[PDB]
């Protein structure tokens, strides 16, 4: 059973890269150079404080 | 016959082998069939059974009898039973369910197949005699009149028919040796005949009679099959720890 | 004395504090690798047969343990540093049962390219063979084999997954090369992969460059642990 | 040109195969004919160089 | 030792055979032990098991290593496992629990016995490698440094000690053939090595060192035993339907 999918194509606009201006309140898709391909962030402790950038 | 196929033919299936028959058999049993209980009283070693190998039906010989040699009493096959040892020179071969072991015992079943035409007449009589080779009147009991009184099956050549002869184990040991123990004097410890439980007799009950035509077959083949219901082996040795001597044929 | 056996331990200290393999770093470190490593080089016009139609350009034998390394001066990635992780990982095991993922890059062409997979073809080669110098009746596209036709105008990297189709219990890796059995030709490799060009039109003067990268799959497994064969240090490749 | 049977043509469309095979023997005889045949299945053999009834 | 008799010695009993040991073993298992389930998917014929014959412990070889030939890495025995075929000329013999059948499979157990004096020192390392004969780096993995990473048992000569190496069935078939199928080209259907599951390695971990005395023994014998936990046979043929070729030795 190889059913046909005659579902209308969707008009899509191609662009080279994601926003260069956006710095917060959004997601930035990228090719993470890691072995784990999920949402990955550096491990921390009390030895390594939060960013002090208020 | 009466179908696009032939008639429906009966079947007999054992381990790894199937035999086909088309007509009604002619059967009989050598003696009262039983369950061996004094055999465990002869060997301290655990017995072994090989159902997949011993229950198999095997074809060992096929003899041809023609009209010119078919006379009342003509012995078609006269061999010591059970002895089915076949090798390139006259020399038990490990090529089949056969074991090079010291002692063994089992019940046997003999099936005789003959395939004649609708236009021939004759009779074969397959009999068996427990340790007949050891009787002082052996050569005297080969005549069909004597075979009729022994356990036996009859084959009609005027009908295509099969036959089975059940031969339960009977012996004086009660474990017969597969090979020889040759170191003994004639006065004490005489040489022991390996696997000699009896003599299988097939003979001509009624001379094979054919049509007088030239293009008609004057020879008929008699094929035989043998099987073992339950086999036990209690002598474990090297295949060449003891050796097999040339079978001493005993004909009259 | 099992492979891991400590008869009398003299441990002066406590154990080191447990990390998870992903805590002071953020990835879980175990022996599974879908990291893609190279497999071949480039092709020119003078390599292909006189009638290059439905004739493959490359005959790629499929081995989990990679191909037989061959050092060249044109290709230093094989010479100064040995083959990638995958063939050194498979060197400590005996059997595999999974399929392989192949990523293939064709750069000197803007014309359509095909890739076909031959599972039952005996893998008796340890090196890829190109064009004219390919054995006849090979590098001929077959009809009823798993394949994928791709245009280089749309995308010039082909990603396919080669299945495991062997009539056996396992798949043998680290197979010897030259003189047989029935386990070295039908039970070792996943088969052969044929790469050809849809057209018979001549190859551009500059030639074409085919780089084949591959990785392991999920249904793949390194079943029996064997001893590690003696290795060679890449750091001593200058003296 | 080979007149292949259904099992053979299909099998030529697939790489590997397995299962029992059913060989039907049809005889052009009448009630008068009589015989017995011993058809065997020898595993691991592909010729009759060492093949005999016994 | 300390009794009118010697010390109490441990015993290991299988079918029709008993092995005696006096000290603590050194053991290991080749791979994860299991129960074969895809073997019934390879043969339509019923499998056969012969516990009384296959469970037996057999002695096949005894090698002597002297001080003069005892060097680090010295291979005392390097043979393809499992191959225990012994005959008068270089030619599987039916003299023991060995069958001339097409296919078979089983798990193996190897016991190494060494009997040294209270005054010698040395180390033997008995290892096994699944289908090592088919690896492109076979001859390269014979060095004891490589044997340490394979499933293996260690023998100390400074203590009298036995060792057992459990080797569960692992293969690509999953039924290995006992005899050859020789009709094939080198390109397709290459000749199949009968019963080649791997290579059994024993070697010198530490050179055999004896006393400097003249009347002291300078040679020590290393005897080996092999056994099968559960064996299955699914290829029934004539003992001479296929034949046994001369074992192709493969040494480095």
């Amino acid at each position: 059973d190889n059913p046909p999918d005659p579902t209308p194509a969707k008009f899509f606009v191609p662009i080279p890269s994601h926003s260069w201006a956006h710095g917060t309140n959004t997601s930035e898709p990228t090719n993470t150079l890691r072995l784990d391909g999920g949402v990955v962030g550096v491990g921390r402790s009390d030895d390594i404080g939060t960013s002090d950038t208020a | 016959m009466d179908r696009p196929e032939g008639s429906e033919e009966r079947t007999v299936q054992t381990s790894n082998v199937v035999l086909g028959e088309t007509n009604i058999e002619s059967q009989d049993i050598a003696s009262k069939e039983y369950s061996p209980t004094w055999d465990r009283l002869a060997s301290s070693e655990v017995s072994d059974e090989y159902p997949m190998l011993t229950d198999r039906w095997l074809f060992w010989k096929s003899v041809k009898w023609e009209v010119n040699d078919s006379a009342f009493g003509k012995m078609l096959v006269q061999e010591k039973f059970p002895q089915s040892w076949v090798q390139m020179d006259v020399n038990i071969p490990n090529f089949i369910p056969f074991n090079i072991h010291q002692y063994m015992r089992a019940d046997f079943e003999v099936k005789i197949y003959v395939n004649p035409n609708d236009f021939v007449s004759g009779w074969l009589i397959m009999a068996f005699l427990y340790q007949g080779s050891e009787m002082f009147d052996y050569k005297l009991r080969r005549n069909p009149a004597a075979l009729m009184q022994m356990p036996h099956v009859l084959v009609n050549v005027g009908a295509a028919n099969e036959a089975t002869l059940k031969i339960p184990y009977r012996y004086v040991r009660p474990f017969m040796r597969c090979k020889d123990i040759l170191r003994g004097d004639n006065l004490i410890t005489g040489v022991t005949e390996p696997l000699n439980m009896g003599v299988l007799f097939v003979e001509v009950l009624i001379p094979f009679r054919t049509s007088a035509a030239s293009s008609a077959p004057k020879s008929l083949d008699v094929s035989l099959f043998v099987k073992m219901t339950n086999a036990k082996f209690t002598g474990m040795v090297d295949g060449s720890i003891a050796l097999l001597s040339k079978p001493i044929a005993l004909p009259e | 004395t099992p492979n891991v056996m400590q008869p009398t331990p003299l441990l002066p200290t406590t154990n080191d504090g447990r990390v998870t393999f992903g805590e002071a770093f953020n990835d879980l470190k175990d022996l599974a690798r879908r990291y893609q490593l190279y497999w071949e080089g480039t092709i020119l016009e003078g390599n292909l047969r006189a009638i290059r139609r439905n004739s493959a350009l490359v005959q790629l034998p499929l081995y989990p343990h990679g191909l037989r390394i061959q050092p060249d001066v044109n290709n230093p990635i094989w010479n100064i540093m040995r083959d990638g992780h995958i063939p050194v990982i498979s060197s400590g095991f005996r059997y595999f049962r999974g399929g392989l993922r192949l990523r293939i890059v064709v750069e000197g062409l803007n014309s359509c390219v095909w890739v076909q997979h031959h599972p039952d073809r005996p893998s008796i080669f340890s090196r890829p063979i190109i064009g004219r110098y390919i054995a006849a009746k090979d590098a001929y596209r077959n009809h009823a084999y798993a394949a994928y036709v791709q245009n280089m105008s749309v995308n010039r990297t082909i990603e396919v997954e080669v299945p495991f189709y062997q009539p056996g219990l396992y798949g043998m890796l680290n197979a010897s090369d030259n003189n047989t059995s029935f386990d070295r030709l039908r039970f070792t490799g996943l088969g052969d992969l044929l790469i050809g060009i849809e057209g018979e039109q001549p190859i551009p003067k500059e030639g074409i460059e085919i780089s084949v990268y591959y990785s392991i799959a999920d249904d793949f497994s390194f079943n029996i642990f064997c001893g590690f064969p003696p290795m060679v240090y890449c750091d001593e490749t200058y003296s | 040109q080979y007149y292949l049977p259904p099992i053979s043509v299909v099998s030529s469309l697939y790489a590997y195969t397995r299962g029992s095979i059913k060989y039907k023997f049809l005889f052009g005889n009448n009630p008068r004919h009589n015989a017995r045949l011993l058809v065997a299945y020898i595993p691991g053999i592909s010729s009759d160089n060492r093949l005999t009834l016994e």
Side-chain angles (χ1 to χ4, degrees), chain A, chain B residues 1-31 33-48 50-55 57-60 62-63 65-108 110 112-132 134-140 143-163 165-172 174-202 204-210 212-225 228-240 242-252, chain C residues 1-33 35-37 39-67 69-82 84-102 104-239, chain D:
Chain A
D1 61 298
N2 196 35
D5 185 39
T7 282
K10 297 182 174 301
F11 278 134
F12 260 41
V13 175
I15 54 179
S17 54
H18 300 75
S19 184
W20 302 68
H22 300 174
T24 188
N25 195 44
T26 188
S27 301
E28 181 169 6
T30 182
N31 296 285
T32 57
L33 297 174
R34 341 188 71 119
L35 184 54
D36 192 306
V39 176
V40 165
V42 79
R44 284 195 172 72
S45 63
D46 293 311
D47 293 283
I48 310 154
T50 63
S51 178
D52 283 76
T53 50
Chain B
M1 178 49 75
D2 53 7
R3 298 182 175 185
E5 62 179 300
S7 301
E8 174 174 31
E9 71 184 308
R10 283 167 53 262
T11 183
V12 175
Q13 189 190 313
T14 52
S15 55
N16 189 264
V17 49
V18 175
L19 297 181
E21 314 193 318
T22 58
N23 289 26
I24 303 301
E25 299 189 10
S26 182
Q27 47 198 349
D28 184 50
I29 312 83
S31 61
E33 192 163 54
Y34 68 107
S35 179
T37 177
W38 272 15
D39 62 306
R40 65 165 183 176
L41 205 62
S43 178
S44 173
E45 192 187 70
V46 290
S47 306
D48 291 319
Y50 310 83
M52 214 60 67
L53 298 174
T54 64
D55 200 68
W57 278 103
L58 276 60
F59 168 67
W60 70 327
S62 59
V63 179
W65 67 316
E66 62 182 353
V67 185
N68 299 318
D69 190 43
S70 296
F72 179 70
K74 168 61 182 180
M75 303 182 288
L76 216 49
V77 170
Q78 167 181 230
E79 303 171 298
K80 295 173 296 182
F81 200 77
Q83 290 192 352
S84 308
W85 320 330
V86 188
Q87 202 57 29
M88 36 190 62
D89 287 342
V90 192
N91 326 306
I92 304 78
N94 306 296
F95 305 102
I96 350 199
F98 287 112
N99 308 319
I100 304 178
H101 291 334
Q102 300 303 69
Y103 316 118
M104 77 148 284
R105 67 164 291 137
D107 297 34
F108 308 103
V110 179
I112 170 180
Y113 289 152
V114 177
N115 292 283
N117 294 137
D118 201 292
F119 290 97
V120 288
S121 63
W123 281 80
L124 293 179
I125 171 178
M126 173 171 261
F128 179 78
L129 183 60
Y130 283 116
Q131 285 183 88
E134 298 251 302
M135 294 180 83
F136 59 66
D137 51 285
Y138 170 68
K139 303 187 300 179
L140 194 68
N143 182 59
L147 293 181
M148 259 307 301
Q149 296 179 55
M150 324 189 328
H152 74 285
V153 302
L154 300 179
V155 176
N156 189 334
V157 187
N161 71 288
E162 299 84 334
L165 181 63
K166 293 298 298 300
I167 310 177
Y169 182 98
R170 292 293 183 181
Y171 198 51
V172 72
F175 269 113
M176 51 182 57
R177 38 196 60 176
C178 306
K179 299 182 292 180
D180 312 66
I181 317 298
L182 273 156
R183 277 161 299 164
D185 184 53
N186 189 51
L187 177 62
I188 303 212
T189 31
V191 50
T192 63
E193 189 77 69
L195 258 51
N196 184 41
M197 188 176 91
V199 178
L200 182 56
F201 286 109
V202 63
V204 180
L205 185 56
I206 288 185
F208 180 46
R209 304 174 187 297
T210 58
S214 59
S215 58
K218 307 296 176 58
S219 180
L220 191 57
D221 281 39
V222 179
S223 301
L224 306 185
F225 283 79
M228 294 157 74
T229 64
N230 58 314
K232 297 180 180 179
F233 304 78
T234 55
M236 183 178 177
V237 287
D238 183 54
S240 53
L243 202 57
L244 284 300
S245 58
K246 175 178 180 178
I248 304 176
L250 295 168
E252 44 193 286
Chain C
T1 320
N3 297 317
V4 186
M5 194 278 189
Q6 307 202 275
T8 302
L10 281 71
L11 179 48
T13 185
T14 57
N15 290 271
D16 183 48
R18 255 196 185 184
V19 196
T20 42
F21 304 120
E23 201 273 344
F25 292 113
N26 334 309
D27 304 328
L28 287 68
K29 276 65 191 66
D30 306 305
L31 196 54
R33 218 55 55 77
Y35 262 110
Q36 323 254 40
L37 74 85
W39 249 29
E40 193 184 50
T42 175
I43 301 176
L44 292 180
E45 171 56 65
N47 294 31
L48 292 186
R49 302 185 178 186
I51 307 178
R52 38 177 174 291
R53 189 182 182 69
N54 290 93
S55 302
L57 289 57
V58 183
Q59 194 192 9
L60 273 178
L62 301 171
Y63 296 117
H65 53 288
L67 304 172
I69 311 175
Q70 168 169 173
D72 294 316
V73 310
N74 296 297
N75 217 320
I77 199 174
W78 300 103
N79 182 51
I80 175 171
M81 41 184 62
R82 218 52 51 68
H85 43 287
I86 302 301
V88 335
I89 293 178
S90 53
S91 60
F93 297 111
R94 197 73 196 76
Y95 308 105
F96 80 95
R97 194 138 213 277
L100 298 176
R101 295 199 174 95
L102 305 180
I104 305 176
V105 180
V106 184
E107 274 301 316
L109 262 176
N110 206 66
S111 61
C112 191
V113 180
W114 84 72
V115 281
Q116 207 177 70
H117 168 46
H118 303 64
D120 65 322
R121 180 183 291 183
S123 57
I124 43 74
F125 283 133
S126 315
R127 289 291 299 177
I129 312 304
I130 308 175
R132 296 164 180 171
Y133 311 110
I134 296 180
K137 311 171 186 177
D138 301 39
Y140 273 149
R141 180 211 286 248
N142 297 41
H143 293 284
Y145 270 118
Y148 183 40
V149 183
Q150 181 177 301
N151 297 312
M152 299 299 99
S153 55
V154 181
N155 191 39
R156 287 184 305 188
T157 172
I158 306 176
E159 271 187 352
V160 301
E161 180 179 300
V162 173
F164 180 99
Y165 296 150
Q166 313 190 337
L169 204 70
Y170 283 117
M172 200 191 309
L173 47 73
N174 298 155
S176 36
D177 289 349
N178 298 310
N179 182 61
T180 61
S181 58
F182 170 53
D183 310 324
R184 188 179 311 174
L185 47 73
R186 198 61 67 87
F187 298 147
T188 51
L190 288 62
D192 291 45
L193 175 79
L194 297 186
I195 304 83
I197 309 301
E198 271 291 277
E200 54 177 0
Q201 269 181 40
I203 292 182
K205 311 176 301 177
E206 307 76 5
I208 60 177
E209 311 168 301
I210 291 71
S211 52
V212 179
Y213 294 77
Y214 82 122
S215 293
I216 321 174
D218 317 305
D219 59 287
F220 198 108
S221 64
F222 299 76
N223 302 97
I224 308 298
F225 174 75
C226 300
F228 271 118
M231 300 298 178
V232 186
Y233 276 102
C234 304
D235 187 49
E236 57 171 51
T237 187
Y238 272 70
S239 182
Chain D
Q1 314 176 64
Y2 305 84
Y3 282 76
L4 302 181
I7 176 177
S8 179
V9 185
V10 177
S11 299
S12 299
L13 295 175
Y14 290 104
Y16 314 112
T17 174
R18 56 176 286 166
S20 297
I21 299 178
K22 320 182 304 175
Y23 292 112
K24 180 169 58 180
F25 296 107
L26 181 147
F27 299 76
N29 67 309
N30 55 62
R32 308 291 151 269
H33 300 97
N34 204 343
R36 260 201 169 74
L37 310 173
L38 187 153
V39 193
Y41 179 85
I42 321 302
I45 304 301
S46 301
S47 64
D48 54 312
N49 290 130
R50 301 172 61 75
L51 198 62
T52 61
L53 169 60
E54 317 180 313

